[PDB]
């Protein structure tokens, strides 16, 4: 009697497994952090076996809490941190090395050469992205360049490539299924989002054996069934997959062109549904696939802000300025300063709409009275500021009007930050009823496919949403604050690094 659905959200620093019920209500949830590795400044890696172990854990943890049994799960929904790359042995199923995370700059040299060789326009035409170490493409090249016997085993058909979603479904199906969905495939920089196929030109260019590639299917259909690993009592269907950000657009019910949301997590990502047309004009932004359902493919415009929650974790672990991350709001709220201190946390370069890899974290406006509180507040408001940069670029590019912004993610818990966001943007901000919209969208994709829910209607029905933030900040203030940011970013960009 399958009356539930489970979503697995494999994020950047922790996992999660939430069991939803027919009404979209949590019945059990479990979360767990897993090891982050930093071999060199700018590098970020994860051990895939450990990601797997953290997923098995939260999976168990969710059953243990809910009191439900695997036999009651109607389908599994899988969403994940995108770009992140894993290359493993087909037969042994052992990763050839650590996985390279979307945050890593270790493959940047590889990507710079592509830019020099003039492949920019060509990659953007085929993939809708920009040439940067952010995407999977260069990461797989890095792995085949720095791991002994890797390239050989690849040409030979012994190694398998796969982003996190592909890796998890592979482990869940004990190697029987090597698949990935449009949304995730589009973020590898090897997928042709227009002809919906792996681009042979790009593979050839990066010398990546197409034998490493998984099959690319839609975001909602049965890819296969669980073999075991804790799903005792049944072979549950794996029926939903998507990059966390796209699954979050879905869980926000941003089904129609123009509906836009923003997720506040490790990084912040603005995603706008642009309907069946792969958006004409996207300078400074990313054109990607939102999701493919009901035989159609819906595209999206994306604004990437790499460092958001990580800036706060830096304050806790790096500068030891704050006891715990949650202590931010409290400290920020106490701020006394004139609010003219700016923090541009471009640790690894400025993302959308700057896309400037030669920039680094900077701070401006510091005086004698500047306090810890002021400094913390500044670090928090940064994402509010860059979000406006991204939203403004979206209007200029698409000419669409943005009257509301649905938001979600851990950081969205901050009422002060969300208010600030509304004030700065001068538009309405509507926080999702439940901030784990990501795992929800994954559950929706899975549910729809197995019959748990009928269609994008018996879904809009449970539109239980609330917590709106309206602009209340005067214009004179709203404009100084943003003008100062624009100037702070400009100065941040004059200080160049590189090579």
Binding residues for ATP: 12-14, 266, 309, 313, 410
Give the integer Cα–Cα distance in Å for 287 and 128.
Answer: 5
Q: Which is nearer to a copy of itself, 35 or 39 (CB)?
A: 35
Options 60, 205, 321, 433; binder of a copy of itself; rule CB under 8 A: 60
What are the start-end ranges of the E strands in 130-194? 159-162, 179-181, 191-192
Q: How far is the CB of 35 from a copy of itself (least distance, A)?
A: 14
56 binds a copy of itself (CB under 8 A): yes
Q: What are the residues whose beta carbons fall under 8 Å from the beta carbon of 178, sequence distance 6 or more?
A: 160, 162, 166, 170, 214, 215
Half-sphere exposure of 379 (CA within 13 A, CB side): 29
| CA 297 from centre of chain | 19
Question: Looking at the chain, after which residues does the C atom sit over 2.5 Å from the next written N, breaking the chain?
Answer: none
- Give the range of 53-61, 316-324, 343-351, 460-468 binding a copy of itself by CB under 8 A: 53-61
Residue with tokens 């403004």: 392
Give the integer Cα–Cα distance in Å for 193 and 185.
Answer: 9
Q: Which is nearer to a copy of itself, 70 or 409 (CB)?
A: 70
- Give the range of 54-62, 215-223, 270-278, 372-380 binding a copy of itself by CB under 8 A: 54-62
Which residues are 4's β-sheet partners?
21, 73
Q: How far is the CB of 229 from a copy of itself (least distance, A)?
A: 5
Q: How far is the CB of 168 from a copy of itself (least distance, A)?
A: 15
Residues 61-100 contacting a copy of itself, CB under 8 A: 61, 64-65, 69-71
Binding mask 185-224 for a copy of itself (x = CB under 8 A): ----------------------------------------
User: With contact defined as beta carbons under 8 Å apart, do 48 and 162 qualify?
Assistant: no
Residue ranges for the known binding site for ADP are: 12, 16, 266, 309, 410, 414
Q: How far is the CB of 134 from a copy of itself (least distance, A)?
A: 31
Give the integer Cα–Cα distance in Å for 243 and 258.
Answer: 19
Helix 108-116 crosses helix 120-127 at what angle (to 10 degrees)?
110
Q: What's the token pair of residue 304?
A: 């990437």
31 binds a copy of itself (CB under 8 A): no
57 binds a copy of itself (CB under 8 A): yes
- Give the range of 51-59, 177-185, 295-303, 406-414 binding a copy of itself by CB under 8 A: 51-59
Q: What is the DSSP string of 43-93?
A: --EE-HHHHHHHHHHHHHHHHHHHT--GGGEEEEEEEE-SS-BEEEETTT-
Give the integer Cα–Cα distance in Å for 273 and 275.
Answer: 6
50 binds a copy of itself (CB under 8 A): no
Options 39, 109, 149, 233; binder of a copy of itself; rule CB under 8 A: 233
Which residues are 95's β-sheet partners?
88
- Give the range of 18-26, 55-63, 320-328, 330-338 binding a copy of itself by CB under 8 A: 55-63
Options 94, 228, 367, 461; binder of a copy of itself; rule CB under 8 A: 228
Supply the DSSP symbol for 255.
Answer: -
Vertex 129 angle, CA 126 and 132, to 5°: 120
- Region of 275 (left: φ > 0; alpha: ψ -120 to 50; beta: rest) is left
The number of residues that bind a copy of itself (CB under 8 A) is 16
Q: How far is the CB of 46 from a copy of itself (least distance, A)?
A: 17
53 binds a copy of itself (CB under 8 A): yes
Residue ranges for the known binding site are: 12-14, 16, 82-83, 134, 244-245, 266, 309, 313, 410, 414
| CA 22 from centre of chain | 26
Q: Which is nearer to a copy of itself, 38 or 232 (CB)?
A: 232
495 binds a copy of itself (CB under 8 A): no
Q: How far is the CB of 238 from a copy of itself (least distance, A)?
A: 17
Q: How far is the CB of 10 from a copy of itself (least distance, A)?
A: 15
Q: How far is the CB of 228 from a copy of itself (least distance, A)?
A: 6
229 binds a copy of itself (CB under 8 A): yes
Q: How far is the CB of 2 from a copy of itself (least distance, A)?
A: 15
Give the integer Cα–Cα distance in Å for 386 and 486.
Answer: 9
Q: Which is nearer to a copy of itself, 93 or 361 (CB)?
A: 93
Helices and strands (H, E) in the chain, number of each type: 15, 23
Peptide linkage before 353 cis (omega within 30 of 0): yes
Residues 309-338 contacting a copy of itself, CB under 8 A: none
- The β-bridge relationship of strands 179-181 and 215-217 is parallel
**Which residues make up the interface to a copy of itself (CB under 8 A)?**
53, 56-57, 60-61, 64-65, 69-71, 228-233
């Amino acid at each position: 009697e399958k009356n539930y659905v489970m979503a697995i959200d494999q994020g950047t620093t922790s996992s999660r497994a939430i069991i939803f019920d027919r009404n979209g209500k949590k019945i059990g949830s479990s979360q767990k952090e897993f090891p982050q590795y930093f071999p060199k400044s700018g590098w970020v890696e994860h051990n895939a076996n450990e990601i797997w172990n953290s997923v098995q854990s939260v999976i168990a943890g969710a059953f243990i809490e809910s009191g439900i049994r695997p036999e009651a799960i109607a389908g599994i929904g899988i969403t994940n941190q995108r770009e992140t790359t894993v290359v493993w042995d087909k037969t042994t199923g052992q990763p050839i090395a650590n996985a390279i995370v979307w945050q890593s700059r270790q493959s940047s040299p590889i990507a710079d050469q592509l830019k020099v060789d003039g492949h920019t326009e060509m990659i953007h035409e085929k993939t809708g992205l920009v040439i940067d170490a952010y995407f999977s493409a260069t990461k797989v090249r890095w792995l085949l360049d720095n791991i002994e016997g890797a390239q050989e085993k690849a040409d030979n058909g012994e190694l398998l490539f796969g982003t996190i979603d592909s890796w998890l479904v592979w482990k869940l199906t004990d190697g029987q299924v090597h698949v990935t969905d449009y949304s995730n495939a589009s973020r590898t920089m090897l997928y042709n989002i227009h002809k919906l196929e792996w681009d042979q030109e790009i593979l050839d260019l990066l010398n990546i054996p197409s034998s490493m590639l998984p099959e690319v299917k839609s975001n909602s259909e049965v890819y296969g069934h669980t073999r075991s690993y804790e799903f005792y009592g049944s072979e549950v269907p794996i029926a939903g997959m998507a990059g966390d950000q796209q699954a979050a657009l879905f869980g926000q019910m941003a089904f129609e062109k123009g509906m836009i949301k923003n997720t506040y997590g490790t990084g912040a990502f603005i995603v706008m549904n642009t309907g069946e047309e792969p958006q004409l004009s996207d300078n400074d932004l990313l054109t990607t696939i939102g999701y493919g359902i009901n035989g159609k493919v819906y595209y999206a415009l994306e604004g990437s802000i790499f460092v958001a929650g990580s800036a706060i974790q830096w304050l806790r672990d790096g500068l030891r300025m704050i006891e715990t991350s949650p202590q931010s709001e409290e400290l920020a709220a106490k701020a006394k300063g004139d609010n003219e201190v700016y923090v541009v946390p471009a640790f690894t370069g400025l993302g959308a709409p700057y896309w400037d890899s030669e920039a680094r974290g900077a701070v401006f406006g510091l005086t004698r009275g500047t306090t810890k509180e002021d400094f913390v507040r500044a670090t928090l408001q940064a994402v509010a500021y860059q979000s406006k940069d991204v939203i403004d670029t979206m209007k200029k590019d698409s000419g669409i009007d943005i009257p509301l912004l649905k938001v979600d993610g851990g950081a969205a818990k901050n009422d002060l930050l969300m208010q600030f966001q509304a004030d700065i943007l001068d538009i309405d901000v509507q926080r999702a009823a439940n901030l784990e919209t990501t795992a929800l969208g994954a559950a929706y994709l899975a549910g729809l496919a197995v019959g748990f829910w009928k269609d994008l209607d018996e879904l809009k029905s449970m539109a239980e949403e609330g917590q709106m933030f309206t602009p209340e900040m005067p214009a004179e203030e709203r404009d100084n604050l943003y003008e100062g940011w624009k100037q702070a970013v400009a100065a941040t960009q004059t200080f160049k690094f590189k090579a």
